[PDB]
Design a protein around this ligand. Structure first.
Ligand SMILES: C[C@@H](C[C@@](C)(CS(=O)(=O)N1CCC(OCc2ccc(Cl)cc2Cl)CC1)N(O)C=O)c1ncc(F)cn1
Ligand SMILES: [Mg+2]
Ligand code: NA
Ligand code: NI
Ligand code: NI
Ligand code: NI
Ligand code: NI
Ligand code: NI
Ligand code: NI
Ligand code: NI
Ligand SMILES: [Zn+2]
Length: 282
């Protein structure tokens, strides 16, 4: 059976100001990458992330209170998004989940290494189906997949329950993603059970005129200078391939993330899975 995750994307005042007019393309660029990831066969389910609504909070007072407190920010946003969801799924802009994006540096009690936040097993509960994502660059696309995993009842891959079942999207710490198997067996089992138990019944309807997702690779929209800007601010640029984006700040810096797929790395070549390869595949 085919599940469709009708989504409202929301950007706060920090996003509007930082991104200007290009904000909405940026949000859908990030979300198209998430959608691709959920179409990977390793999830062992048929799941279509679709956009039915986008809100930009130009005026802070017209949005939820956003703070460095990542937990309090999720809760603030989860309460706030209820007033903007039409009561019936028959409604066209009715959404099964809501995601907030902020330039704000998210922190837990311990560090500000926090990238994102969601409760576990909330997808068909309109009071609880929410995520907040830190915009630290195109890599936030993967924070978004991760958070939605939690929303789909996925625990981290080092959770005790994942032992006999189990590099993948639901890792508790950042490292090299297996591009041939983005989702672990634990992950597949856990979303599969969640849906089998009946907690994905809201996802069966098809969206009405959903907001169209970019079909091109993200690096086609955004060159390496732009990617450095997204992560390090507008004055940053690409440091004088593909494996690690290094950026100015001659002083250079990196969040140890690859160049986005599609990023030009010479005439006739672009990045694909951290490798500079010919655009005309043999
Ligand atoms: C207690 C929280 C832990 C929390 C907030 C930790 S975290 O913010 O550091 N975090 C873990 C790493 C994860 O990595 C995503 C990712 C994967 C591949 C690439 Cl290529 C890039 C990226 Cl970005 C992002 C979120 N956390 O896990 C939040 O989700 C917590 N919250 C919910 C839980 F279910 C468990 N723990
Ligand atoms: Mg890739
Ligand atoms: Na942070
Ligand atoms: Ni604007
Ligand atoms: Ni666009
Ligand atoms: Ni305020
Ligand atoms: Ni594995
Ligand atoms: Ni400037
Ligand atoms: Ni360059
Ligand atoms: Ni470092
Ligand atoms: Zn997590």
């Amino acid at each position: 059976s085919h599940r469709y995750v009708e989504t409202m994307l929301v950007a706060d005042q920090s996003m509007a100001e930082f991104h200007g007019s290009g904000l909405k393309h940026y949000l859908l660029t990030l979300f198209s990458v998430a959608a691709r990831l959920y179409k990977h066969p390793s999830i062992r389910n048929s799941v279509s992330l679709v956009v039915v609504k986008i809100l930009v909070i130009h005026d802070e007072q017209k949005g939820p209170e956003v703070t460095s407190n990542a937990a309090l920010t999720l809760r603030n946003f989860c309460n706030w998004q209820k007033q903007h969801n039409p009561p019936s799924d028959r409604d066209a802009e009715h959404y099964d989940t809501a995601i907030l994006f902020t330039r704000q540096d998210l922190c837990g009690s311990q560090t500000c290494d926090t990238l994102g936040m969601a409760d576990v097993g909330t997808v068909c509960d309109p009071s609880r189906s929410c995520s907040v994502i830190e915009d630290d660059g195109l890599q936030a696309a993967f924070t978004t997949a991760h958070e939605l995993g939690h929303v789909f009842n996925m625990p981290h891959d080092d959770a005790k329950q994942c032992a006999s079942l189990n590099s993948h999207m639901m890792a508790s710490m950042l490292s090299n993603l297996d591009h041939s198997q983005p989702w672990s067996p634990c992950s597949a089992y856990m979303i599969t059970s969640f849906l089998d138990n009946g907690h994905g019944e809201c996802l069966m309807d098809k969206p009405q005129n959903p907001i169209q997702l970019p079909g091109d690779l993200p690096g086609t929209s955004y060159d390496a200078n732009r990617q450095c800007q997204f992560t390090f601010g507008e004055d940053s640029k690409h440091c004088p391939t593909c494996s690690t984006l290094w950026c100015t700040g001659l002083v250079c810096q990196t969040k140890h993330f690859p160049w986005a797929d599609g990023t030009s790395c010479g005439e006739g070549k672009w990045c694909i899975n951290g490798k500079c390869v010919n655009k005309l595949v043999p």
